[PDB]
Each structure stands twice: as C-alpha cells, then as structure tokens.
Amino acid sequence: TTKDVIQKGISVVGDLLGVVGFPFGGALVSFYTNFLNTIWPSEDPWKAFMEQVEALMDQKIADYAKNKALAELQGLQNNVEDYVSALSSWQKNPVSSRNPHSQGRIRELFSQAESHFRNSMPSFAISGYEVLFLTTYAQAANTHLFLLKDAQIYGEEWGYEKEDIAEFYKRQLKLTQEYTDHCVKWYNVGLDKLRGSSYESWVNFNRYRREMTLTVLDLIALFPLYDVRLYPKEVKTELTRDVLTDPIVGVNNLRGYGTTFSNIENYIRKPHLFDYLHRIQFHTRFQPGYYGNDSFNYWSGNYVSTRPSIGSNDIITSPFYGNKSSEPVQKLEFKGEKVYRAVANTNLAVWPSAVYSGVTKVKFSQYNDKTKKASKQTYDSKRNVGAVSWDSIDQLPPETKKKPLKKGYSHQLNYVMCFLMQGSRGTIPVLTWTHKSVDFFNMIDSKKITQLPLVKAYKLQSGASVVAGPRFTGGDIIQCTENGSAATIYVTPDVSYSQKYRARIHYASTSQITFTLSLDGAPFNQYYFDKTINKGDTLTYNSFNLASFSTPFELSGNNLQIGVTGLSAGDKVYIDKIEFIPVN
To answer: Which residue numbers delimit the Pesticidal crystal protein domain (predicted)?
Structure first.
C-alpha cells in the first residue's frame, strides 16, 4: 500500500518486459543489476511486501514466520548477488578467457542459488499465512524461475552435463505450473475474504485487486516467456487487463453514504474487447454551503466514449452515469492522446448535521505519439475548486524515475464512471486504467516472437464473447460456444518484404477441434488441436496448450480471422493469444 512497494512491482514488470524470451547478454546483465537494486538490495522491500498484504487484509503474520522468511531471503540475496557478479564476468570476458576453472565456479554459484530457492520457498507458504506472504512468494518465485532459464541460455558454455541442463528445464516447467497455480489460488482466497456489502469494504476489496494485480498477477503472466526453448527469440507482448484506482472522494469517512459494494462491483466494466479513451462529457452541479461563502460546483455525472482496437472506428458511447448537469456540460476529446496522469481537486461543505463533498477539478496529462507533444486538458467546475487531494501517480507510479513521466508512466486512462452516493448525497468518480505495454497498431515484429491477445480483436462473431481470464494470462480471454468464425484482429506488418511466419495459439478446449486462420477472408492455415480439459473443469495453468500450425505464411493483408469447428453441444473453446514466429 506504500507507493514504494507498488513502484517496485511496476518497475520490475517494466524491466522484465525488456528481457522476456531469449534476451541479449547485454540486456540480461543490465536487467539483473537493476533487479538486485529493486527487489534484492536489503531486507527492506521484503518487510514492505509482507506489510503490504498485512495492511490489505488487516491481519498479522506471526513474528516467528516473518523472521524465518526474512532469514531465508537474506541467504537468497547473497546467493543471487554472487551468481550475478559471475554472470557479469562471464558476459564481459572474451570467449578465449573461458577456462574450466571459471566454468566450475559459475556452475557452483548457479546450483547453490537454485537449490536455496527450493529450500526456502515453503517458508513463504506457511499454512494460515499463504495470503499475507503472497507478494513475497510471488517476488521470490519470479527470481527462481528467471534464474532457472539461465541454465538453458548458458548451460552448454558453462560445461553443465546435458543431463543437468535437462533436469533444470523440467524443474522450470514444473515450478512455473506450481508457482502460477499457488499465486492464483491464494490471490482468490484473499479477494473472496475482502468481499462485503459496504462502500469501505469495496474500496479495500478493489485496492487488494489493483495492488495484487501489479505485484503478483502481472508477474506470473511473464513466467512462461522465461522458457527460452519455446521462446528462443525476444518477445513482443502486452498486459491487457484493466485496473481501477481508488474512488476520488473529498473526505476519508463518508459515514455510510458511500455507494454499496453491490452498486459499484456489478456496474464497473465487465470483460470486453480492448479499447481506448476517446471522449468524456463532464456534467456539473451546485453544492450550496450552509452559509453561502463555502458553496462549490462539483462533477455530478458523465458520459464516456471509447475507441475500439485498430480495425474499427465505431465509437462506443456509455450510458449516462450519475446526475445530469445543472451547469454547461464540458467535453474533452482524447483521439490520438495517451492520458498518463489524472490529478483531482476536491472540496467539502460542513452543514449542521451533514458533510457534502465532491470532485471540483481534474487535470489530465497527455502524450500524442504522432506529434510527440505533452499537453494538459482540464475539467474545472468553475466554483471554489479547493486543493489537489488525488494524484493517479500515488497508485499507478511510473515504471522508471530515470526518464520524465511522459516517457516513464506505467498506465493510461481507459474509462471514467460517476457513481452516486446513497441518499442523493453526491457523486464518486472511479477511473479505469490499462498498461503502457498495449500496442494500438497490433504491430507484428519481423525479428521477435509477437504475442497478440485475442481481446485486441475489433470484432467477435458466432457467439464468441470476452470472459474473465484465469488470472495468469495478463488479461481476459475469448469464449467460443459455436462452430464458425470467432474473432477478427487487425495486424500491422512492421515490414513490406515477404517475411514468413509460423502461428501458435494458446487455448483450452473441451474437445478435439480445428482452428482456421484467414487473412482478408482468405484462409491460409487449418490444423487439428488437442482437447485440454473436460466440460466444467475450472481453468488452471495446465488447462491451456501452446500449439503450432504446420505451414508458414506471409502477412498479405491485415484482417486476421480465427475460426473454430469440431464442437458438439456444450463444448467450450478459450482463446487467449495468437503468436507470430518469424521464420526463413
């Protein structure tokens, strides 16, 4: 709940997105030096991660458990530091320096760090504290899996036996599964415990959801990309999930007048095809002060419009949220802009037996990618705006403080929704944000493996819907219930020459199925894919398969259609991502 641990979580994910798949040696060492200063400088971040989930759950880890965890983490910091200085020497030193003595040294350090991870991890899963340890367990599990894949990159040149390399690989596969399924199960236990009826219980529920998304679920989404055998190239990918910031209110205690849990949770955006902020229409109302001197105008309701993913410009305008304007409606246009900060003012008026508060002003910081200009747009109530009380950067800090905010920001604004306080007491704005990794163009790299989440489709067909992701994929997924075309996604080639690709798909199916790929309505790939689950199974890590199509193709068009056939009554297919592998 400290911005510090959240800034750390957000940085690490940002840094890891530059070394997913098979990294350059340069990039890996630079990544590791920054990683050691973020997650592994001292016991401090470990204390803060434990305190984070203790604060979110209003619960304490037994002093005994916490000290044993901190002791283990100290042993791991030393082992990781020592491994990294040897990897740095290995990477810098000429190929003609590499002697059996220095090979035996780095095998020793790697084997010791790796072994220590296996001895320690149960210390971050003590029975009854699995939730309170979740961020600790996630950040340690991440380090172990990231470390393990180095045995695949360097194992041969380090003089590991083929047998040793293979044993590390099967341990990487098994622990990817176990660490993922553990983080999801215990994320859900904590989330279910925070469910209540009150406004306050919703704010705490949703804060746990955002902070655990940033420090846990966003991390586990990257685990499979550490498999440099399946991903022996750099990877282009994105996190497609949305997060909600804390509601913007002018008081710390609304005395029971806050919107009920039910009246927020059931009305926030349900899973949907990915979209972008296009327009907000601000409605304003007058809040009289008891003595007249302290009156203010406030943000009472809104419309909001989003633009679909590349391939459709049919703007989606929301229903009306909140209370209709008494003042002139203010309209802000966001076409071509990324909103990377929102800073809000609130005011309040004390009456004899009531307090009225609302939001009086919002400054939007925005970046235009075409013209490369940072600019600001402002909603201003135009009456007695008060002080700044709310800054998005306190909840969604930047990936890096090295660069300025317009380059280093983590999230852009997707949506705005005005909820009503009980008993007509006023309006609570809630903002929804998406991750900077999301690429508007769905650009297909000519050198990297490109991951295209199907929620980046502009169109679904034949009873295909967006449904909740299983919490380890970085976003939501497509459910297909009928034989036919499912989804159309527009893709942008990065090159005009006849670059060939192979396609892979990450899916789950209750049945042997056929997937058909078409470009601009012309099929180019059809293949058989295995059943992965039984009807009614709950989706876990192993419910999904990454499977290839046979035949290479060119991008001779932009409209990629994915269809599925071979379903009987009751069959279900889940499509997460399609991937493009450049081949010769």
So the answer is: 23-227, 235-439, 449-584
